[PDB]
C-alpha cells in the first residue's frame, strides 16, 4: 500500500527535488537529476495539457506519500469543505501524522516519519496513534514516547531538521521531543512551486 | 399493545438502542409510532448515555403504553440522576 | 417545437438494441463447439482468422473468434463466450475466452497472460 522502489527515479521524472532524501548529500551529487529516468531521458518531449496536470498531481502525490485512492478521497473532502478547493486539499495533505511529524523534525524523510508512526513511536495528546493518515487538529500535542526518545535516528533527524527551512505553524521542542500544531498552514505558508489549479482541473473530469 | 422498548441500530459488538414506542406485534427494529430518546451501553464518559423523554413516557403510560424491562430500569436511573 | 404540441406528443426516446443479443445481458455464456474452422477477412486486409460456430446453452447459435495462436479446442468442446466483436470479420459478435473449462491458454506467453489464461512462469 506504499511505494517500494527507487526514491530518485520519481524525482528525475518530475524534474524537481521531491525531498525524498534527508539532505546530508547534495541532490546533484546523489543522482544525475537533470533528465527523466530510463534510456530515453535525453530527449525533451512536449508535454500535453493533460500531461502537465497528470505530472503535477503525480508530483504532489509522491511528495506527500499517498496513493491514488487516498488522494481522490482528500480531493472529495476538499471540494466538500468550504473555501478554496486547492488550498483545502493542500491543508488536508499537510495535516497527516507522518507529514506533521516530519515537519516538526522527528523523522529524516517521509518514509522514515511514516515508519516511526507505524511502529508506535508517535503519541498525539498523550495517546498512541499508529495511523499514517491520522489527521491532526489545531492545538494538539504530538510527542515522542518515552521508550523511543533514545533513538539515534530520531535524534539525528532532530539535529538535521534545523539547517533547512522552518515551518511557522508548528511549536517544536527537541528537549522533551514534542510539538504543538498551532494553526492550519496557509497557501503562502506552504510551498509556492505547486500549481493548485492543475489538480482540480485533472479531477474535474 | 403499545410498548416502550428498544431497537438496535449500531454495529456488530457496538450496540446502540433507539428507545421507541411500537406495537407489540412488530419487529424489534421495524415500525414504531414515535421515537423517545436513545441509549448506548458503551458510551464513554463526559458524554450523554441516556436521553429519555420522560414527558412522552408519562404521556404514553397515561394512555396505557407498557414499559419494557430495560427502559423501566433506565427511567429510574434517569430520575435518580436528575 | 412548441409546448402545445409536446404535451400532446411527448418527446420519445431513441432506444437502440444491444450488439450482443445472444448474451441476453450476460457477461459470460457457456457453449459447446459445433463448427470450428478458419475464415478470411474482408477487402481492406487479407489473413486467415480462426472462428467457431458454437451453440449457446439458452439456444442461440453464434460465431466466435479464437484469440492468440494455438487452440486445442475442437467439436464437442465446452467453451466460455464473452462479448466483443471483430471489426474485420462480418457476422462475429463474441469472443471465446481462454483459460475456460476446456479452452487452453496460449503456450509460451509472457505479456498480457491474463487475457489469454496463462499461468505465471516461475
Amino acid at each position: 500500500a506504499r511505494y517500494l522502489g527507487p526514491k530518485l527515479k520519481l524525482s528525475r521524472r518530475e524534474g524537481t527535488d521531491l525531498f525524498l532524501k534527508s539532505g546530508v548529500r547534495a541532490i546533484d551529487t546523489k543522482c544525475k537529476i537533470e533528465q527523466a529516468p530510463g534510456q530515453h531521458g535525453a530527449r525533451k518531449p512536449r508535454l500535453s495539457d493533460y500531461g502537465v496536470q497528470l505530472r503535477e498531481k503525480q508530483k504532489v502525490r509522491r511528495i506527500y506519500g499517498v496513493l491514488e485512492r487516498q488522494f481522490r478521497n482528500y480531493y472529495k473532502e476538499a471540494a466538500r469543505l468550504k473555501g478554496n478547493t486547492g488550498e483545502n486539499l493542500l491543508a488536508l495533505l499537510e495535516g497527516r501524522l507522518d507529514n506533521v511529524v516530519y515537519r516538526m523534525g522527528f523523522g529524516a524523510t517521509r518514509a522514515e516519519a511514516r515508519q516511526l508512526v507505524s511502529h508506535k513511536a508517535i503519541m498525539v495528546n498523550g495517546r498512541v496513534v499508529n495511523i499514517a493518515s491520522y489527521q491532526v487538529s489545531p492545538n494538539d500535542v504530538v510527542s515522542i514516547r518515552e521508550k523511543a526518545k533514545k533513538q539515534s535516528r530520531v535524534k539525528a533527524a532532530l539535529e538535521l531538521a534545523e539547517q533547512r527551512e522552518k515551518p511557522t505553524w508548528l511549536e517544536v521542542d527537541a528537549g522533551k521531543m514534542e510539538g504543538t500544531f498551532k494553526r492550519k498552514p496557509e497557501r503562502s505558508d506552504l510551498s509556492a512551486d505547486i500549481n493548485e489549479h492543475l489538480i482540480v482541473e485533472l479531477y474535474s473530469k | 399493545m403499545v410498548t416502550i422498548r428498544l431497537a438496535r441500530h449500531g454495529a456488530k459488538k457496538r450496540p446502540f438502542y433507539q428507545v421507541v414506542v411500537a406495537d407489540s406485534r412488530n419487529a424489534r427494529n421495524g415500525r414504531f409510532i414515535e421515537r423517545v430518546g436513545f441509549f448506548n451501553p458503551i458510551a464513554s464518559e463526559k458524554e450523554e448515555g441516556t436521553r429519555l423523554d420522560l414527558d412522552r413516557i408519562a404521556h404514553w403510560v397515561g394512555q396505557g403504553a407498557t414499559i419494557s424491562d430495560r427502559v423501566a430500569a433506565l427511567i429510574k436511573e434517569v430520575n435518580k440522576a436528575a | 417545437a412548441t409546448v402545445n404540441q409536446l404535451v400532446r406528443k411527448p418527446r420519445a426516446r431513441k432506444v437502440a438494441k444491444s450488439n450482443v443479443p445472444a448474451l441476453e445481458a450476460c457477461p459470460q455464456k457457456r457453449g459447446v463447439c459445433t463448427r470450428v474452422y478458419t475464415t478470411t477477412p474482408k477487402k481492406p486486409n487479407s489473413a486467415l482468422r480462426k472462428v467457431c460456430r458454437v451453440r449457446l446453452t439458452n439456444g442461440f447459435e453464434v460465431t466466435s473468434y479464437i484469440g492468440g495462436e494455438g487452440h486445442n479446442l475442437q467439436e464437442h468442446s465446452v467453451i466460455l463466450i464473452r462479448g466483443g466483436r471483430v471489426k474485420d470479420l462480418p457476422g462475429v459478435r463474441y469472443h471465446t475466452v481462454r483459460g475456460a473449462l476446456d479452452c487452453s491458454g496460449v503456450k509460451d506467453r509472457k505479456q498480457a497472460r491474463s487475457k489469454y489464461g496463462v499461468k505465471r512462469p516461475k
Binding site: - | - | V3, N4, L6, V7
Partner: protein, 80 residues
C-alpha cells in the same frame, strides 16, 4: 367552510342522479404549460332541479351507490 366543488353538469338522464364535470386548472409538471383536466363525477341529485349545461355545486358525504359519492347543495347559473 365545507369543502365543495363547483362544476358543469353533463347528463341528467338518471333517476335522482346527474353527471357533473369539473375543470381544474393545473400546470404541466414538465413543460410548465397550464392545461385543464376533466373531473367528471356522478352526483346523487335528489329532486333533480337541473338540466344540461347549468353549473352546480356538490359535496362529498358518503358512498351512496357503486359509482357516486357526491351530493348537490345549490344550483347557480340555472338560467340558459
Amino acid at each position: 367552510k365545507i369543502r365543495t366543488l363547483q362544476g358543469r353538469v353533463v347528463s341528467d338522464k338518471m333517476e335522482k342522479s346527474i353527471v357533473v364535470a369539473i375543470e381544474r386548472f393545473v400546470k404541466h409538471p414538465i413543460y410548465g404549460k397550464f392545461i385543464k383536466r376533466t373531473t367528471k363525477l356522478h352526483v346523487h341529485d335528489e329532486n333533480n332541479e337541473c338540466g344540461i349545461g347549468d353549473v352546480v355545486e356538490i359535496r362529498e358525504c358518503r358512498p351512496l351507490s357503486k359509482t357516486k359519492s357526491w351530493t348537490l347543495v345549490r344550483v347557480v347559473e340555472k338560467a340558459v
